[PDB]
Amino acid sequence: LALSLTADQMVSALLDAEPPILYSSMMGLLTNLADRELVHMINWAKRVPGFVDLTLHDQVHLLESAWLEILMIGLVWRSMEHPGKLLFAPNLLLDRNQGKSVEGMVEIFDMLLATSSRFRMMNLQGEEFVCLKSIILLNSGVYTFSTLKSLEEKDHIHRVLDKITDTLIHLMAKAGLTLQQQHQRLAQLLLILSHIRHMSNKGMEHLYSMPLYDLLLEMLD
């Protein structure tokens, strides 16, 4: 059970669950990439402690709400060592000028780059990244689930979320930050999740300007 994992077991479990880096006119290639990444995201999600404990429909609701944020935080994480570029795939590395080549995408491209720089600046660690990605999955769809079962599901989510918060703090203490630094960095990282939400919402409007439930359900069952 997720609730009885230590901090180290949480980290280890999330690190093990990491999906592969996939390989790649542009929207064709990006779409093809993302669609293939989704199949592995579902697999990753089944390994996030606590996630399989939820009902199938709740599982679907969470992925339905979080999938683009998850693709974007992975994007932003793999683009950290490539200032001014987004590493969509090891063979698809794109600059803002290439992003301009698509109607509607420069502004989000620009948001994506800036997030990547911010991760670089904070020197985001891999262990921290996997916690953040897990928080997105469990948090993004949660408030948009009055029934008896919903009470139970929400309670479980907020206990797993609390476990992940403990894990982030443990990581920051091991690294030798002061208590004050720990809370400050925790806060810094969580506020970044709000930008990621923002990019995802703008991403979706952009994608829709050119049903997923059934598809996740098939993949999840």
Binding site for 17beta-estradiol, by residue number, is 37, 78, 206
Contact call for residue 180 and a second copy (CB under 8 A): yes
Element (H, E) at 85: strand 85-89
Q: List the single partner that 38 binds among a second copy, ligand LLC, none, CB under 5 to 8 Å by kind.
A: ligand LLC
Q: Which is nearer to a second copy, 10 or 89 (CB)?
A: 10
Contact call for residue 167 and a second copy (CB under 8 A): no
Task: Tell me how far, at minimum, the Cβ of 1 lies from ligand LLC, in Å.
Answer: 31
Select from 140, 153, 160, 216 the one that contacts a second copy (CB under 8 A).
140
Q: List the single partner that 165 binds among a second copy, ligand LLC, none, CB under 5 to 8 Å by kind.
A: a second copy
Exposed e or buried b for every residue in 128-151, given b needs 16+ CB within 10 A? bbbbbbbbbbbbbbbeebeeeeee
Q: Are 206 and 105 in contact (CB under 8 A)?
A: yes
Q: Are 28 and 36 in contact (CB under 8 A)?
A: no
Element (H, E) at 203: helix 179-208
> Is residue 40 helix, strand or coil?
helix
Name the one range near a second copy by CB under 8 A: 1-9, 36-44, 72-80, 201-209: 201-209
Select from 35, 81, 103, 162 the one that contacts a second copy (CB under 8 A).
162
Residue with tokens 């290439």: 98
Contact set with ligand LLC (CB under 6 A): 30-31, 33-35, 37-38, 71-72, 74-75, 88, 105, 108-109, 203, 206-207, 212, 215
Nearest CA to 14 among 122, 120, 131?
131
User: How far apart (Å, rounded) are the C-alpha atoms in residues 69 and 7?
Assistant: 24
- Distinct helix (H) and strand (E) counts, the chain: 9, 2
Task: Tell me how far, at minimum, the Cβ of 148 lies from ligand LLC, in Å.
Answer: 28
Contact call for residue 96 and a second copy (CB under 8 A): no
User: How far apart (Å, rounded) are the C-alpha atoms in residues 143 and 151?
Assistant: 11
> Is residue 8 helix, strand or coil?
helix
Nearest CA to 209 among 112, 103, 108?
103
Name the one range near a second copy by CB under 8 A: 17-25, 36-44, 158-166, 212-220: 158-166
User: Which stretches of the chain bind a second copy, using CB under 8 A?
Assistant: 110-111, 114-115, 118, 135, 139-140, 143-144, 158, 161-162, 165-166, 168-169, 179-180, 182-184, 186-188, 190-191, 193-198, 201-202, 205
